[PDB]
Write a protein that binds this DNA or RNA. Structure first.
Length: 452
RNA sequence: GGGAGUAGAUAGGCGCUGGUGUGCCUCCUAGACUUCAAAUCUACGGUCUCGCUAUUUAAGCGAGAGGUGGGUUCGAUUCCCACAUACUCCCG
RNA sequence: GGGAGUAGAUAGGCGCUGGUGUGCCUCCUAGACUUCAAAUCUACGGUCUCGCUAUUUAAGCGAGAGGUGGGUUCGAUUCCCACAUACUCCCG
């Protein structure tokens, strides 16, 4: 027992084995981790050999020297992929962020008056113009955007909402569970599938401080189903003197039909010009910018929200703020194609095949590869457009040696890693989400796994 | 004087390491080598000590200590704790 | 790959039954009968593995396997459960 462990060398001795091989710091860390795995494996009597030690210690070093979060090549064809980090950023934005983070900036400083200033002041100019709302505000994310409006205007008082709009988006967010913690009392009207206007108007009373509607972003209902029109709820509010609050969620900044895609998804400008008092949404969904809770509406309300002592715990960071301004700057200049998420969904059907076969031309040489391009209909929107179904070209592949399952697995372990769909033992690569500079990296990773 | 930080050798200065210590530089001594010097290289080397044989001394041989003590642990130079000391910083 | 639906013999295909399994069809065979055929009819029949008796062989017989195990029960081929395996459909 006590000889199968004395064996394990000394950390000073393996540090030497890797003089300039690897940084001394990373070597000792790998030696300790490895030194402990052999002390316990020999104590339980499951190891008789120690030759695996030297080879392993170097593997920990090779592993411990790489950050965990890593860029990932998305081949699934889902633009708003909740799991892969939603809306990706254009180089233009990322450099504007790079520069403001490089050194000091006038984040909370107004250069004119030479005294402290509100950091939320830089942006709001853009929002008010783009939406048409009276005033605006921005916080960490939309989850908090909701929580803030409720605790600001309905703490202790009733909020009416349709029983079909109490959603569970994400793993931890649930309108009913957060609104609870929001301090607002929840008044659910109508039924799951159907909800008329009479349901809303019927539950109003002395405590009703808010009429709230949530947009079913991550799901939808078909069959016998009724919903309350937006113009109707504005009318109902202005009748009793109650505010209207729409949680768009998708955070669509513009009309979407303007780009060829025909859908009813709501957007700020239009929802604002409808008579709604407040509107919110995430910046990293249909806006295509960094994570951000966006609120626009009546000035008297925005000012009530801002003054809330909880807004300081949600106030946005220096990175997303800047990055959001450049994203908004692009919107004013109509540079639509510059923002990843808008370009990916409004891409020419022709455009997609053009990239579908430019990849197939790069994989015909690789050994054992069965390459075919198929025209499939998928659902692009992951966290904002549930029903949408648009055509896109998938380059379906298949190797004689390895199986589709094992294939996805190694591809997610590659550097860079690639995540893709699987359908009937045929790995699939949706080109709707693939950047050009990835095509070269796709071919170089597949040739390293099948010819190695 | 009161706190706190940095700390520690078993030739000497610095740095490291849960594997019974070790690497860099220096000193010393020794060896190798070198026309001379230098350079270079090497050392289960060195301190203290104690104990053993002889015992005037010489001479040969064996063992332990890491400021001190304790603890964890298969194993502590490494880690914890307590006290001491050195250097430094703040206060009366 | 994950779910789910269909499932299973003790000659072989289909159907049934809490009564120690059974009906239709086939196979194999066998027997009966008819001037001849043809037809028809009939069968406490049948596998495996092991074991047993006789033991040259025959020949006869016993056990269990109804995928495997378990349970309920007076009795399980039936019912349930678990695992595994075969056919099909939904999802990643």
């Amino acid at each position: 027992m006590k000889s199968l462990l004395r064996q394990i060398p000394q950390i000073s001795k393996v540090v030497e084995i890797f003089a300039k091989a690897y940084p001394e710091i990373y070597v000792v860390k790998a030696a300790r981790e490895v030194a402990e795995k052999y002390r316990k494996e020999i104590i339980e009597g499951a190891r008789a050999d120690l030759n695996g030690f030297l080879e392993d210690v170097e593997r920990k070093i090779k592993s411990l020297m790489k950050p965990n979060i890593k860029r990932v090549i998305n081949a699934t064809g889902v633009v708003i992929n909740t799991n892969l980090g939603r809306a990706p950023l254009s180089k233009d934005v990322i450099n504007f962020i790079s520069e403001i983070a490089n050194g000091y900036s006038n984040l909370e400083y107004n250069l004119e008056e030479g005294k402290r200033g509100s950091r939320i002041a830089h942006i709001e100019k853009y929002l008010n113009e783009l939406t048409g709302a009276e005033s605006s505000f921005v916080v960490n994310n939309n989850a908090g955007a909701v929580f803030l409006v409720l605790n600001t205007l309905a703490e202790g008082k009733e909020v009416i909402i349709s029983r079909g709009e109490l959603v569970e988006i994400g793993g931890s967010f649930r309108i009913p569970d957060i609104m609870k913690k929001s301090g607002a009392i929840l008044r659910e009207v109508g039924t799951t599938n159907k909800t008329k206007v009479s349901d809303y108007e019927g539950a109003i009373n002395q405590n009703t401080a808010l009429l709230m509607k949530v947009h079913k972003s991550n799901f939808y209902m078909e069959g016998f189903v009724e919903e309350v029109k937006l113009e109707d709820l504005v009318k109902l509010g202005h009748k009793y003197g109650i505010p209207t609050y729409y949680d768009a969620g998708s955070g669509l900044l513009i009309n979407l039909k303007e780009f060829g895609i025909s859908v009813d998804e709501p957007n700020f400008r239009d929802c604002i010009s409808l008579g709604i008092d407040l509107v919110s949404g995430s910046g990293d969904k249909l806006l295509g910018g960094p994570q951000a809770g966006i609120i626009v509406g009546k000035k008297n309300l925005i000012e009530k929200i801002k003054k809330n002592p909880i807004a300081r715990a949600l106030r946005i960071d220096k990175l997303t703020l800047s990055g959001l301004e450049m994203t908004l700057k692009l919107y004013f200049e109509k540079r639509y194609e510059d923002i990843p998420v808008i370009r990916m969904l409004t891409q020419d059907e022709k455009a997609l095949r053009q990239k579908a076969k430019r990849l197939e031309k790069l994989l015909k040489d690789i050994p054992g590869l069965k390459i075919s391009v198929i025209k499939d209909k998928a659902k692009p929107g992951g966290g904002s457009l549930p029903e949408l179904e648009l055509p896109t070209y998938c380059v379906a592949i298949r190797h004689d040696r390895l199986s589709s399952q094992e294939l996805s697995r190694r591809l997610r372990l590659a550097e860079p890693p690639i995540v893709c769909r699987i359908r009937e033992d045929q790995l699939l690569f949706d080109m709707r989400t693939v950047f050009h500079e990835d095509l070269k990296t796709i071919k170089k990773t597949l040739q390293e796994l099948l010819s190695i």
